[PDB]
């Protein structure tokens, strides 16, 4: 008799075939072009895309003019619009299945800060996300696996306590300044 949670789900799945060529090569290709870390990232994104596709298939297998189907269809369509993967021009229930894994990987905060121009390189982008430097709507973020919503896009900038954002100099710079003042003093 304790008041605990006991709720947990696995976010990744392992494929049936462990050793072959083509899928391993293309996952390595995606990790290379998007600056990810390991295979659990692409396994997680493939699992959540498979869950979205399974929900879309369960919605599509029922008949038209059922209002439960209409409610979950409109809610899921508005969610995929609000993430920013699907466009507002094509908002129908059959366009869910016409999606790829790179569209889900494109809304990553790492790729967004890389393509915004504030980060020079994608490895530098992931480092700078981990480095406590950015802020989104005046709130700093450590985590590169941050799904950015479409409207919270213009409010990405360095934090006020960042040396690149104007403020206190860095620890290495102040150490070298202390050494220079000691040597010249």
């Amino acid at each position: 008799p304790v008041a605990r949670s006991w709720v947990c789900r696995k976010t990744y799945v392992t494929p049936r075939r462990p050793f072959e060529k083509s899928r391993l090569d293309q996952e390595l290709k995606l990790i290379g072009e998007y600056g990810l870390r390991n295979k659990r990232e692409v396994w997680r994104v493939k699992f959540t895309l498979a869950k979205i596709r399974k929900a879309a298939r369960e919605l599509l297998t029922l008949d038209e003019k059922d209002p439960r189907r209409l409610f979950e269809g409109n809610a899921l369509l508005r969610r995929l619009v609000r993430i920013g993967v699907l466009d507002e021009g094509k908002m129908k229930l059959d366009y869910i299945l016409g999606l790829k894994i790179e569209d889900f990987l494109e809304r990553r905060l790492q790729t967004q800060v890389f393509k915004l121009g504030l980060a020079k390189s994608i490895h530098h982008a992931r480092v700078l996300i981990r480095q406590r430097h950015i802020r989104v709507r005046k709130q700093v973020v450590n985590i590169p696996s941050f799904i950015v919503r479409l409207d919270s896009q213009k409010h990405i900038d360095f934090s006020l306590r960042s040396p690149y954002g104007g403020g206190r100099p860095g620890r290495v710079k102040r150490k070298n300044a202390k050494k220079g003042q000691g040597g010249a003093g």
Partner: protein
């Protein structure tokens, strides 16, 4: 070097008179020159090697071994192919396999699953193929689910241009030749099926022989 015809088919595809191969599959007319495929199907046709299995005899003096080269072929938007060749060594077997795979070419028709939107991506009906003990089934699939099969019919379906299918196999699957021939027979029976779409009673277009006999009676006799 420069290709000279044997039948009148090479003549009619050489003097720029046949528009495409689609009328040749329309008239159910056999193609027995593999370089017509080279002329009309361009660089989109790509090649792969399925399995190199040696077979051997038994005489007084040793076992005379010969290679059996299994090669399928097909451009990624439309047509497929399959070739079985058995020669002495491996290189001539491979070359004969790619020639025979360019010879036996069936086209495939791509259909839809349930909803009818956009470009086709799926087998239009539950087709099947049988040879030996292999039973290869092709079940229509929703969009974007990928190929769900064994590796070599996955290869045949991605060079078929069909992106989304479900399969179900039965029998001694370990024999690659029978399994590949069964999925080739399954994928060849796509047009060999009657659907409500095909209910329009078509008119019979005049044969290319019937309109180019005025040239092939005077060129070659």
């Amino acid at each position: 070097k420069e290709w000279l015809p044997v039948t009148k088919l090479g003549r009619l595809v050489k003097d720029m008179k046949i528009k495409s191969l689609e009328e040749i599959y329309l008239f159910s007319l056999p193609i027995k020159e593999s370089e017509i495929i080279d002329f009309f199907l361009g660089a989109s046709l790509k090649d792969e090697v399925l399995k190199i299995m040696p077979v051997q005899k038994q005489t007084r003096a040793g076992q005379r071994t010969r290679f059996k080269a299994f090669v399928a072929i097909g451009d990624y938007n439309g047509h497929v192919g399959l070739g079985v060749k058995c020669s002495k060594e491996v290189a001539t077997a491979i070359r004969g396999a790619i020639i025979l795979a360019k010879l036996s070419i069936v086209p495939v028709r791509r259909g839809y699953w349930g909803n009818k939107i956009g470009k086709p991506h799926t087998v239009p009906c539950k087709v099947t193929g049988r040879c030996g003990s292999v039973l290869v089934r092709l079940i229509p699939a929703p969009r974007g689910t990928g190929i769900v099969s064994a590796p070599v019919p996955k290869k045949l379906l991605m060079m078929a241009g069909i992106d989304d299918c479900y399969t179900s196999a039965r029998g001694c699957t370990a024999t690659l030749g029978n399994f590949a021939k069964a999925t080739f027979d399954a994928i060849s029976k796509t047009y060999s099926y009657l659907t409500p779409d095909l209910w329009k009673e078509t008119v019979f277009t005049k044969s290319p022989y019937q309109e180019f006999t005025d040239h092939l009676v005077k060129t070659h006799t």
